[PDB]
A paper describes a structure:
To investigate the structural variation in the 9-6-TV, we collected three cryo-EM datasets of the purified 9-6-17 TV. The first dataset that we collected for 9-6-17 TV has inverted image contrast whereby the virus particle is brighter than the background. We reasoned that this was likely caused by the residue iodixanol (OptiPrep) in the buffer not being fully dialyzed away. When we examined the density map of the 9-6-17 TV, we found a density bridge connecting the two subunits of A/B and C/C dimers at the position of Cys452. Additionally, two mutations (I451M and R452C) are positioned at the interface of the P dimer, contributing to the stabilization of the P dimer through the formation of a disulfide bond. As confirmed by the results of ELISA, it has lost its binding to the original TV host cell receptor, B-type HBGA.
VP1 subunits further divide into two domains: the shell domain (S domain), constituting the inner spherical shell of the virus capsid, and the protruding domain (P domain), further divided into the P1 and P2 sub-domains. In this study, we introduce, through cryo-electron microscopy (cryo-EM), the structure of a specific TV variant (the 9-6-17 TV) that has notably lost its ability to bind to its receptor, B-type HBGA—a finding confirmed using an enzyme-linked immunosorbent assay (ELISA).
Numbering used by the authors:
A (entry chain C), D (entry chain C): 6 to 527
B (entry chain B): 20 to 527
C (entry chain A): 268 to 527
E (entry chain A): 135 to 267
Write the structure that this text describes.
């Protein structure tokens, strides 16, 4: 069908099925559960279906990739949580923003299941497909068939994918009119469910309901016992090699990450003899691991969720970590006092800043092979926020969290925590300096995330309401744990408030660029 | 096509009295109150531009009749007008929202609802019938209502025009639409038409600076946000904070004046404001007397910043030897007290009597204080529902009621010399007059025409329910002025997101 | 806003009791002294304390020499209207006014804050506004229809006496205003039916006690009163509410006993 | 109906009647005079029907306002002069300039009679109406009905109005393409006249024929006996408070304005005793008013059309007015001689510069209560063109002409007159200085205006032909008397020639802005 | 409907059941019947209170539904008081002393007692108890 615009211009509401539909008989299905007709009639936006194509996007890179599955339409996905088996295709719609002054083509091809998706103008046309002009636009209705060899799917079956790619780049220099694409779908008339079953499955919940709580209520994994004073963003902090604050939906807490940071914040050491030749006698001590009684590489080499300060790579007499320390005694501990301690030993690499039992202790009179408390508390010496930020190098094979960096153009938003500075009037020899701690992610959000497991291949785009809805920033939360925001400026000290009320916006693809922009320089 | 969901004529048999309407009301078409919004490339995707409800408010004729009637039924034939251009890129999807049903943030989900779409480029408006979804034979007053939600089916990719598009909605009750239960024409619902009496702003009063006529209107980018108390008013909540409908009466005040001296620098003496309105210093009622003062000259300036005041010892019959005296708020040397809202204040008089009421007339300001300093109202923190600090939506600036404050100098050694300054009042009770007279449609903004030269020049301002007016400004300047000729006039109801078509060049 | 005012303060000497000097009110609203526009600045004052009292009756005022930026030495000063010794000028509306200050500069603007009264002046004396005659369509004098009395907005004016020899001491008195702009607010908002008087109910004790008043289009409010008293007062609790449109001849069913 | 443009673009010739037509039976009409069919077929431009809408015009302000009456179409109006009663509607056409690159809507609503016309996008849609797009344009044919409660109108009946307003503002930044709107009309087939009557009525003549005469032939009311040396324009001369040169079509000559300025230029005074304390003894004198023998406020306080120089507000020994003066004697006057005279007295305000009998006279030996001639002649002292321009302040209740200022953007064009300077070689004590006089309007034009009374609510747009048609300026003549031109520059000394040949262009609304522009700076 | 005091004949006004719903449950919002003095007693020659009684009867269409056991929290239309002399009643202020008589005193303008106070809705108020003894 075709229609003219308000005046001039021409827009086509194309409908076609690039690949024929082979409706299954559902004979093997024990019971073919029907479905509400108004669901077929109604259309919904596919998760991650909103991809924007500008004149800068390279031609050939795929912008959208959807598995033909009940997850496409919200209603069908929610029902699929009720049922067990599903069948039938989907009527996907491509809503395009056509102006008749733009110039370019997009191509939508249905990739069969178990077939790799290529990304190039060439080499992608082979698949059954359709080409949409940007000047025509308006709702190319793709009848995405249900490519099947079994009569109806069970959970986990590999599924065909619809992929949209820039067929011909946008070039019309009408002053950078980007084209936004919305994709919607709904079950085809042939779609049917089967085998009703209690509604608890592995489905990612179609909408993840964010508990309306503020960040300052959240705990700081790297700095428990310290409220999250504000959310924070820095350009310099490219990567994050932390092991205490790191959680993911799939693998759970990683490395030293724990869901009770305050609970595990404490640790103990055996205080083995010997010391390095530093001006203050730094007696060695080995952290005792309740979970690793038999020291082996596959488990962590330090107590779960112990410490992540990692002040200096070669910190000698300039930087230190300060901690309460007391000798274990009947009941509790003996005269617990603050002391300047360090990871491993400065004298040797691989131990200067790593994760191992061996650690410096300021206490000159540290008893040989006596259990000693250690509370990392804070930092002293010449440390600063960035020196704290760099976590110690973790090595071995103890499933430690790999260091990660945000996608180009985005930056890691952190849960900034203000660390009080403890200073002694008497000559205890130790004076913690004011410092701050940044946490990649807090377990509180991750709890609701685990409840509403992310849909595979999608990314939680959470918009952060700050001033009662007047100001709404947008942070992209990745399933790996880190949260990122699209930033244009280049500043290290830019701040975000801690008003709260995180809310779920929609499911977007990792490549998706946040429409909202945070000017760090501003 | 035109009707995504066919209307279900209700038999109304349950209605005690079927109140028909003039057929010509159905025949005629007209724009709807508040059904005006601006869509622009700067708009955020997935953000509902506008939300309505199938209700007699859609048609102004139907609303006017609704003031007479208690019950009503039927949908609304709605026609959507687009101020589009050829360069425009995008489509609009309007999805009728049955009551109790939530609205998805995505157009791909809005498509499921009974909807209908046009193109920005096409000129002929599209007609969408928005049926009334009823679970009862007819609809009483105050019940939940199905919503009409307009969403940009496609945002502005080309954006070659780079100027927003105006949308206006027209509605018509369906032939099946019927009223019932005739009642006296007095309803809490907002009147479709707001009639603003012609009163020049100078004819209005300045809450911040009584006794000084509003000399002009002011615009300033520097004054990004408003934290004032006296000026603020609200259509719904009435007066907020210290603000009162009589700034003149509340201007006077007094303090018990306990015999105490300043601690950091004992050149001043401490006095506590009595609270006739608040019998006891409660954390919920205002800490300062109703409508007293919000100069906030000093932030930490113990001496350089000072407020003037006519002060006198209280005696039988009246006060004593009322003389100018310079004063401050709380403890200048104290954090949380140098500039806050509480009883303690500075007093210049070296001699202050132990617990004697002193007249307090804030009068004016002294020292190095300036307009910028006074514009910053004292920071007040507590649990007495202080008036919240507000700022205009991005792209719009506050318009204030500028007032001129005369200076006062003394040759004799009274030690007080009031520096000349200006004052800015957020809103006027004289405009709240007609505001309260005619209610605001919920979640809608009044668009006011301000006429200066007998109609030759008009400035359009948005007046929000919160009580603050804004103007679209392309430029950025600090000292921009607007005359006080007057003749405020109501234009239309617009959504808060609406952008004023007219623009004001501040750099001019 | 109109309360403040200024006078050119020309070099004129008082007659009768010396030590006072004449001053002319400047007319920012009225550029030039005209027989049609008001002779005094808009909304200046109408105290009219004295009728022929050269010294017994007087008005207080905060006055200061006008200079760049602002006024100078704003101090209380005793003042009056026109020529207290002159018939047709003692109590009228003309730029000429008494000034207590012995030192008045030749043609310098002075701040004029009418503030309050002084001397023998009392509430009755202030209640009599100065007689104004001319062609400037001054507000006509009005009286209530027989059997009804005006209801006024009483206000309290604090006194002020000085220990230092400033020579000015304000006597405490009250003030009565015929109508309030805060009520004319809604009056203008909703016009009056032609030739009809609004009958409004005034509620004092949360509805326990009500008082019916008529609000005439001329601005004055009246109440039917069987008794006759001078000092009768009514609480200011509030809650004015419109009852019904009535003809001017209407007699309020409710009655207020003044002797009570 | 619809039609495409030369290529692309789309234009609609809409026809519709927003309000139904109720044709009267004309039963009560004694005789229903028919009307020439070709008049119905033919279309004409309505007076004031050419209103231009640009992207700067505020949305909401009404641009056009036409009473549905025979005055709309020229032919019908001229016939209506022949007849007595009229009936029937009109087919109004909206000719729009649509480009398909513009963007905006205008709204035309038929206001019923005796109903106030509002001006706002909202609050105006209630009336029966139609919305025209600027991209479609081309002749929306509005069938303006004849809203009647009487079967056929008599003269003076209130009539419904068609009002056109900016429904949606023009914004298309195609480099300031303003849109010009022409409105034309013609009687509907039902239109009929009745009761033929001799053709002399109160109708404004449909076209006002300007007598082809030059300004220098015109007289200068403020300075008779002095030819109008040129037409003149000044930025500084904002308002005009003159009482000698002021005429209007409706109320006739106002204040001291007279149709024989030269005839009344003379006056006489009684020369009452007393003088002010100025260095030269300025004897007082009271002007005798033939029309005001009993001095009363309602009539003027000075002789009709006496004097308007008004040199100085506080002119003492620096400025004066000079006039021939002679003592009345048997026959004529005794030794009439020039003398420096003044309005009222400098010593007092309200008399310094006002209109009253009392006036200064230079003559030291001015006889008490002796009639004396006064001929204002010219000016002396330190006067200049602008000091002369300011007329004296007029006060009282003698129906004096109110001071007026032009609409914003326009300026008062004047009839500049060059005043010869009389200088005495002998010590007569008086020396007139060269000066000029500006006149708001001359009675000569107003004579033809009275003949062709202006249509109510319209303004005479007269184009001034100067160089034989090569140069044609445009001056808007308001019925109040003043003539104005749209000026862009800001200069006080800009001049217009006195070639002549004023010609009538068309009837425009007061809000109308002259298309032609005069650059004062140029 | 409007009635005049002077007339003795009763005026019948039908009080319709305004329903936005098929039928009412217990506790729903209901249309109110309001009686107001249309014109005041300006004459006041009587100066005595005029008593008003209201009588009602269900309209023919009036109908019930959903039979249920007869127990509801609503107040009974008729209140039955056992015949008990006040001296047979107990005095909270002074137990052990029978209520000798009922007392009126103009001087006792207001009551500030705690023990005596009782409330139908709130039961005992302040120190008051159902067993003063």
């Amino acid at each position: 069908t075709e229609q003219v615009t308000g005046a001039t211009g021409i827009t086509q509401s194309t409908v076609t099925a690039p690949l024929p539909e082979a409706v299954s008989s559902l004979s093997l299905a024990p019971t073919v559960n029907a479905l509400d007709p108004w669901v077929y009639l109604n259309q919904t936006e596919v998760p991650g279906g909103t991809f924007t194509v500008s004149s800068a996007t390279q031609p050939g890179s795929v912008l959208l990739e959807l598995e033909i599955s009940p997850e496409l339409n919200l209603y069908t996905s929610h029902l699929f949580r009720m049922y067990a088996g599903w069948s039938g295709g989907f009527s996907l719609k491509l809503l395009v923003a056509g102006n008749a002054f733009s110039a370019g083509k997009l191509i939508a091809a249905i990739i069969p299941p178990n077939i790799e998706v290529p990304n190039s103008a060439y080499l992608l046309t082979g698949f059954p497909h359709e080409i949409l002009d940007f000047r025509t636009a308006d709702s190319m209705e793709i009848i995405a068939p249900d490519i099947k060899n079994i009569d109806y799917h069970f959970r986990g079956d590999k599924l065909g994918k619809l992929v949209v790619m820039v067929y011909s780049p946008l070039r019309s220099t009408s002053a950078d009119f980007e084209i936004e694409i919305k994709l919607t779908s709904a079950p085809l008339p042939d779609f049917k469910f089967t085998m009703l079953v209690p509604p608890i499955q592995n489905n990612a919940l179609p909408i993840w309901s964010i508990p309306q709580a503020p960040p300052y209520s959240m705990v700081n994994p790297r700095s428990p016992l310290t409220p999250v004073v504000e959310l924070y963003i820095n350009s310099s902090y490219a990567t994050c090699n932390h092991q205490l604050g790191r959680y993911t939906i799939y693998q759970g807490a990683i490395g030293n990450s724990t869901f009770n940071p305050s609970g595990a914040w404490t640790a103990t050491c055996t205080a083995e003899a010997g010391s390095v030749t530093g001006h203050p006698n730094w007696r060695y001590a080995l952290l005792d691991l309740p979970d690793n009684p038999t020291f082996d590489p596959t488990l962590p080499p330090v107590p779960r969720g112990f410490c992540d300060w990692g002040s200096g790579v070669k910190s000698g007499n300039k930087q230190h970590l300060v901690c309460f320390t007391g000798k274990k005694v009947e009941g509790g501990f003996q005269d617990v006092d603050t002391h300047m301690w360090d990871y491993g030993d400065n004298e040797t690499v691989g131990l200067d800043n790593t994760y191992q039992r061996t650690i410096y202790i300021k206490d000159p009179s540290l008893e040989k092979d006596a259990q000693y408390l250690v509370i990392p508390m804070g930092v002293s010496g010449a440390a600063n926020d960035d020196t704290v930020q760099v976590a110690p190098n973790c090595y071995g094979s103890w499933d430690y969290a790999p260091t990660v960096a945000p996608p180009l153009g985005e930056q890691f938003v952190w849960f900034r925590s203000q660390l009080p500075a403890s200073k002694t009037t008497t000559t205890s020899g130790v004076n913690s300096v004011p410092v701050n701690v940044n946490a990649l992610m807090s377990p509180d959000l991750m709890c609701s995330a685990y409840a509403s497991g992310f849909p595979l291949g999608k990314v939680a785009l959470l918009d952060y309401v700050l001033f009662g809805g007047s100001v709404v920033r947008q942070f992209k939360l990745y399933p790996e744990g880190y949260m990122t925001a699209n930033t244009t400026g280049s500043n290290t000290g830019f701040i975000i408030p801690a008003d709260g009320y995180f809310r779920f916006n929609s499911w977007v693809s990792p490549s998706f660029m946040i429409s909202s922009v945070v000017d760090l320089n501003l």
